Amino acid sequence: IIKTGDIMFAVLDTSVNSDEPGPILATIVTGKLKGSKLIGSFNLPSNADKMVITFNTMSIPGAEKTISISAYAIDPNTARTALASRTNHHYLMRYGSLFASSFLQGFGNAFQSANTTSTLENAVIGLATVGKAWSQQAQQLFNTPTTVEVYSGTGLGILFTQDVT
Amino acid sequence: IIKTGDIMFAVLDTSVNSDEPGPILATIVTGKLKGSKLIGSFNLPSNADKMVITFNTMSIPGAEKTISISAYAIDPNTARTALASRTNHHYLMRYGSLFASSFLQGFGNAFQSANTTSTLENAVIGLATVGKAWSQQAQQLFNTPTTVEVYSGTGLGILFTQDVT
Amino acid sequence: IIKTGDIMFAVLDTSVNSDEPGPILATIVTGKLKGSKLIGSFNLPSNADKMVITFNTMSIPGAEKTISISAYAIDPNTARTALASRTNHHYLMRYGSLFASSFLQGFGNAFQSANTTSTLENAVIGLATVGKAWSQQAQQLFNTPTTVEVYSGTGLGILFTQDVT
Amino acid sequence: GDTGSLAGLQAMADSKYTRAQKKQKMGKIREMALKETALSVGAQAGLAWRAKIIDEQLNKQARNLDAIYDFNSLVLEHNILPPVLLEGRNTLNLADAQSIRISDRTYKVAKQAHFITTPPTWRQYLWMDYVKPEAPNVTLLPKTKAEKEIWCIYTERGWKNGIDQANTILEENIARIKEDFGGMILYRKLLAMNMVSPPYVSHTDLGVTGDGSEIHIDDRVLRITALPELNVNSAEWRAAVAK
Incomplete structure (x- = not known):
């Protein structure tokens, strides 16, 4: 008997990035089992504020059984739901790419417009024509968010949801 | 036997931000149980002036039972419903980003327009073209509200709704 | 036996802002009960000149009974249904935000147009472009009403609606 | 406090206690988590350490235990363990109202005599098991020196508790082996007192036996037929004297 909503511990040792869903294993370290x-x-959050683990399929050694008590994860020694990882994975790359494409287009067109009032003309040429395609492609690829990724050496806490036997 | 609407106190030890739904536990330490x-x-409110915890699944030790009192939260030592956290989380960053994108657009266009009446031209170039994409993207991402977060070291007060055996 | 529409009194102990609906408790401290x-x-009115309490679920101690006399609340010593709270919560904030965004738009456009008849141009730049986006955002957010909040240490009077046993 | 009740009530009439209780509420809410884990690790460590120390002491002083506990002297001529006897003096029972049943002395056969191969030793009664745990895991780590101090003293109290439990188990085993030794020596003394029948055991001997493939040269089958028991005829009881 495990009570409805009590505390247990496990250790996470095999890491994954939050890109493709799949099986992930932990090992319960103390208590009854x-x-x-x-x-x-795991699940994918749209916002980069936390990351949590969907744990469902339990196996107890000794007796060859498989119960499916489902439980989630909390961050150890903070007692919060967040994942200790980086959230600035892909901000500045797409920021700099888009802003460079824009500044290229602006350089070519405005230094073209400043002609009335050969090397600088070729600068106008290169900037004016490589700004636009990179601008629309950067607006195309601008939508991919920053990923989060668990570690291969961090424990975790497991709080129960239902009772088992 | 629990009166229809009495008051109790419980120990809350795990924290969660208002970003991803999930099960959360408290521990009643006084009273009859x-x-x-x-x-x-929890719940996600439209306005972040309060935050409450939806508590429905109780487990009492001794017996293997799971009774079904749905119970809500009040802040201890306040006798109010407000959550003791921050609410100014994500105003100023998106405010400043939008204002900077605007100011870039304005710099390029007005100092391009005031030419008749190379480095300053390149300044006009850079702000003129990187203002617009950042302006539309900032208007895109400007709609994110300010989240709230309970703490991992404060208990709570619990008012009851129904009766249990 | 309770007459059809007499007056009783109770003491209200738990406060809530008028933001999210929820259960609220009071204790009848006089009378036979x-x-x-x-x-x-409670209720959320269109205009915040009063606040009433939708009180329906009545508990009598000792015995496990839950009668259903549903009744409302009035303000003590006014013999009216208003709430003792503040109603000027969110007028001046959105007023000042909207007026500042407008004044920015106006400064940029009119001091741009008054150029015919560098730093002053940069002032034109900044106000000319940060006025407009903040103006439409202020027209977006201008609609949030001014809320009320009940108190945690004030009693209440309850006028009856139906008879019980 | 409530001991100086009127002073405490007049202090609670001020709102300074109301602003002071909001932090001690959080303190007692966060207080109870560390104590159980500290008590658990202290109980395991103190129990293991005390058990190792007391088994070291037993291994040091093993010789005189063998000197005092001569089970081999207690056996009989057919290698049979003597039965266990218990005695009691001045018995009474107020079983209910209108009823008192008293008696002078009582004797009870605890465990019946049986055959044996080797005499039991004290090591089957007094050696404590020892599995040293070397796996410390922490639920919530101490951050403040106050919580570190209460973790330390609760670990120390668990160490003391494990010590007490080891002493309790040792004392119960001491009482058990002393009970068995007293029962055997009381059987011998009561047999001398001529109150208990000796065991009676017959023998049946057969010579060569088996088929053409298996032979046994001489086999003897020994079987006890009359178990010891107490007697009811009082006249056959020789008493004692001394000088």
């Missing part, structure tokens, strides 16, 4: 292994998955 | 822990979830 | 309590909710 010893040597137990739990495979589950 | 001792050692009992209670899982439930 | 001693130690009895009452939970319910």
Whole structure:
């Protein structure tokens, strides 16, 4: 009997990035069930403020059984739901690419417009024509957000949801 | 036997931001039921002037039972419903980003227009073209509201709704 | 037996802002019902000149009974249904934001147009472009009403609606 | 406080206690989590350390235990463990109202005599098991020196508790082996007192036996037929004297 909503611990040792869903394994380290292994998955948040783990398929050694008590993760020694990782993965890359494409287009067109009032003409040429295609392609690729990624050496806490036997 | 609408106190130890829904637990430590822990979830409010915890699934130790009192939260030592956290999280960053994108657009266009009446031209170039894309993207991402977050070291007060055996 | 529409009194102890609906409790401290309590909710009016309490679920102590006399609340010693709170919460903030965004738009456009008849041009730049986006955002956010909030240490009077046993 | 009740009530009439209780509420809410884990690790460490120390002491002083506990002297001529006897003096029972049943002395056969191969030793009664744990895991780490100090003292109290439990188990085993030794020596003394029948055991001997493939040269089958028991005829009881 495990009560409805109590506390347990596990260790995460195999890392993954939050890109493709799949099975992920942890090992329960203390309490009633010893040597137990739990495979589950994750979810993708649209916002980069936290990251949590969907753990569903439990296995207890000794007896060859597979119960499916589902539980989630909390961050150890902070007792929060966030993941300790980086959230600035892909900001400045697309920022600099888009702004460079824009500044290229602006250089060519405005230094073309400043002609009335050969090398600088070729500068106008290159900037005026490589600004636009890179601008529309940067607006195309600007939509991919910053990813989060778990570590291969961090424990985790597991809070129960239902009772089992 | 629980009166229809009485007051209790519980121990909350795990924190969560208002970004991803999930089960959360507290622990009633006084009163008739001792050692009992209670899982439930939260709500996402339209205005962040309050934040409450939806608590529905109670477990009392001793017996293998899971009764179904749905219970809500009040801030202890306030006798109010407000959440003791920050609400100014994501105003100023998007404000400044929008204003900077605007100011870039304005710099390029007005100092391009005032030419008749190379480095300053390149300044006009850069701000003239990187203002617009950042302006539309800032208007795109400007709509994100300010989240709230409970803490991992403060308990709570719980008012009851229904009766249990 | 309670007459059809008499007056009783109770003491209200838990406060809430008029932001999200929720259960609220009061305790009848006089009359025949001693130690009895009452939970319910409130209302959100179109104009905030009053605030009433939708009080429906009545509990009598000792016995496990839950009668359903549903009744409302009036302000003490005014014999009216208003709330003792502040109603000027969110007028001047959006007023000042809208007026500043407008004045920015006006400064940029009119001091741009008055150029015919560098730093002053940069002032024209900044106000000319940060006026417009903040102006449409202020017209977007101008619609949020001024809320009320009940208090946690003031009693209440309850006029009855139906008879009970 | 409530001991100086009127002073405490007049202090609570001020709102300074109301602004002071809001932090001690959070303190007692966060207080109870560390104590159980500190008590658990202290209990395991103190129990293991005390058990190792006391087994070291037992291994040091093993010789005189063998000197005092001569089970081999207690066996009989057919290698049979003597049965266990218990005695009691001045018995009474107020079982209910209108009823008192008293008696002078009582004797009870605890465990019946049986055959044996080797005499039991004290090591089957007094050696404590020892599995040293070397796996410390922390639920919530101490951050403040106050919580570190209460974690330390609760670990120390768990160490003391494990010490007490080890002493309790040792004392119960001491009482158990002393009970068995007293029962055997009381059987011998009561047999000398001529109150208990000796065991009676017959023998059946057969010579060569088996088929053409298996032979046994001489086999003897020994079987106890009359178990020891107490007697009811009082006249056959020789008492004692001393000088």
